[PDB]
């Protein structure tokens, strides 16, 4: 579809922004994150209206923006959900990839 963006993209819908780099995610297919919607992968921003636009962090339905980035019981893998699988039981990878503070997502 469109060309992937350069690294250094800041996701900043909340008070805890995170930088997302496509280059470090080259082993994952585009469509595993810009997931199919009605049979076609969608490339719009995750928080676009009508998409995951509920900014209530206690909302764990599919509309919750915090939920889609962090939770494990999801239909497509979230940021944290896939990272738990990648980090396994290695303390260094868990710190960098899944920690809530002092990790590569949240300083
Ligand atoms: C695969 C090479 C692939 C493509 C192509 C791609 C495209 C893409 C675009 C065009 C954007 C910008 C969207 C906008 O309107 O700002 C964008 C942004 C994000 N991407 Fe992506 N992307 C590809 C692959 C992947 C992979 C493998 C993941 C998941 C690991 C992923 C995730 C994201 C995220 C998150 C964003 C930011 C969205 C937001 O709401 O800010 N992309 N991508
Ligand atoms: C932006 C790259 C983006 C992410 C991240 C994302 C994640 C995501 C997850 C983890 C789920 C599962 C939720 C659960 O509780 O099981 C999920 C599901 C749906 N999504 Fe999504 N999503 C991103 C992008 C978009 C966009 C741009 C839209 C709006 C067109 C959208 C919509 C949906 C819908 C609909 C679902 C439900 C699944 C279904 O049955 O179709 N997402 N998303
Ligand atoms: C969800 C949008 C999401 C975010 C945010 C994210 C962040 C992230 C960081 C900060 C790193 C470290 C490298 C860097 O600074 O770019 C990293 C690395 C890996 N990720 Fe990730 N990631 C998000 C989503 C996902 C998803 C959905 C998957 C799996 C489906 C995934 C996987 C990976 C992998 C693999 C790595 C590299 C690990 C390594 O080389 O040690 N991420 N991600
Ligand atoms: C550890 C499990 C952990 C916690 C706790 C956590 C919390 C957190 C908060 C409070 C926010 C802001 C929510 C709001 O609406 O104010 C937030 C935002 C994002 N996070 Fe997070 N987070 C934890 C861990 C991780 C990890 C390991 C990553 C990267 C894989 C990650 C990612 C994200 C993303 C993306 C966002 C949204 C950024 C934005 O758009 O502002 N979190 N997190």
Distance CA 3, CA 47 (A): 20
Whether the Cβ atoms of residue 92 and residue 102 lie closer than 8 Å to each other: no
Distance CA 88, CA 20 (A): 21
Residue 18 alpha carbon, nearest atom of ligand 3:
5
Whether the Cβ atoms of residue 96 and residue 106 lie closer than 8 Å to each other: no
Distance CA 65, CA 53 (A): 6
Q: Evaluate the CA torsion angle 44, 28, 6, 1 in order and state its sign.
A: negative
Resolution in A: 1.7
Q: Which domains occur in the chain, in start order?
A: 1-107 (3.90.10.10)
67 is in an annotated binding site: no
Find the residues whose C-beta lies inside 6 A of ligand 2: 33-35, 37, 42, 44, 46, 48, 50-52, 62, 68, 74-76, 78
Q: How was this structure determined?
A: X-ray
Whether the Cβ atoms of residue 101 and residue 91 lie closer than 8 Å to each other: no
What would you report as the CA-atom Rg of the chain, rounded to the nearest whole angstrom?
14
């Amino acid at each position: 579809a469109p060309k992937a963006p350069a690294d250094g993209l800041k996701m900043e819908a909340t008070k805890q922004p995170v930088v997302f780099n496509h280059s470090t995610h080259k082993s994952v297919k585009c469509g595993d994150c810009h997931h199919p919607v009605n049979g076609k992968e969608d490339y719009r921003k995750c928080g676009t209206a009508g998409c995951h636009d509920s900014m209530d962090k206690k909302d764990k339905s599919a509309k919750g923006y915090y939920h889609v980035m962090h939770d494990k019981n999801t239909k497509f893998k979230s940021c944290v959900g896939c990272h738990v699988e990648v980090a396994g039981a290695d303390a260094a990878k868990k710190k960098d990839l899944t920690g809530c503070k002092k990790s590569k997502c949240h300083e």
